[PDB]
Amino acid sequence: NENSYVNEAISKNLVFDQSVVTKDTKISSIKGGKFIKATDFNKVNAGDSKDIFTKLRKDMGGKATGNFQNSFVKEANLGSNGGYAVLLEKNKPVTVTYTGLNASYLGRKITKAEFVYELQSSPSQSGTLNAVFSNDPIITAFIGTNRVNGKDVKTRLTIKFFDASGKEVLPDKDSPFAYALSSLNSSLTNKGGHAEFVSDFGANNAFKYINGSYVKKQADGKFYSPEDIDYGTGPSGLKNSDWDAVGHKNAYFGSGVGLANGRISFSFGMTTKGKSNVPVSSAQWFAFSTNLNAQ
DNA sequence: GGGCGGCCCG
DNA sequence: CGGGCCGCCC
Ligand code: NA
Q1: Could you say which residues form the signal peptide (predicted)?
Q2: What class is the A5-286 domain?
Q3: From the Cβ of A173, is strand C under 7 Å away?
């Protein structure tokens, strides 16, 4: 019951981290979504800062007239190889295919991966979400839109791994995939703030609680910290930089572990618990990796 | 063929 | 870490 540990023995049967990214790693195709031109993505509202999260926090419904080539965005948050801006729409799953991987499951080489993103909830007027998908699959995705009502931002993500022979790599029953659900920060208070969350695990997936994590399943079904761990106003006294960093000893404060006996699938998003007037509560960075913040 | 892996080279 | 060319395999 010690902190940073799961109460079930966990093995990193799958490896999907910085070590799997090669010289050849990139997004080779994005299918099923309207592209957002980089010149449109890069504009911000009057008086806004110029960061990727602010650029995500605008309603781009009907402003997605790009193609694969001109959707390419350069932003340091994306890594040195950039990424692609895409509009997510209800019922229109977007398949991002990564090639040139050197990942591995039980020594079985994983060279390709398909990340399929499907809008589930959006608080903008258009009901759409904006996405930038990084060419680095460990940086993965930035999602957001403008907030006009109290609705969650929510996106479902299904991941399929492929070996060199093009066949899907799925787990042995006794050797589940383990993947990190990290950086689930929260500023929620009695009436303000927001939390990033994961939820809606796929069949044969399960969330595993990390001892000492503030992230647990709430009665609304989602996994988040229901109290502020970002600004120091909650009973834990925690601020974001007290735990939210890659490699931080206490990063498990905002993390869980996903375990999958089958194809990986789950949703992630942001919740204000129904409040419409919470600032900077509609854009997030969701990174997928096996960098478990647990032992 | 086109996409994608595994090569080479440098 | 770029680029090409030669595999093979959707
Ligand atoms: Na976060």
Answers
A1: none
A2: mainly beta
A3: no
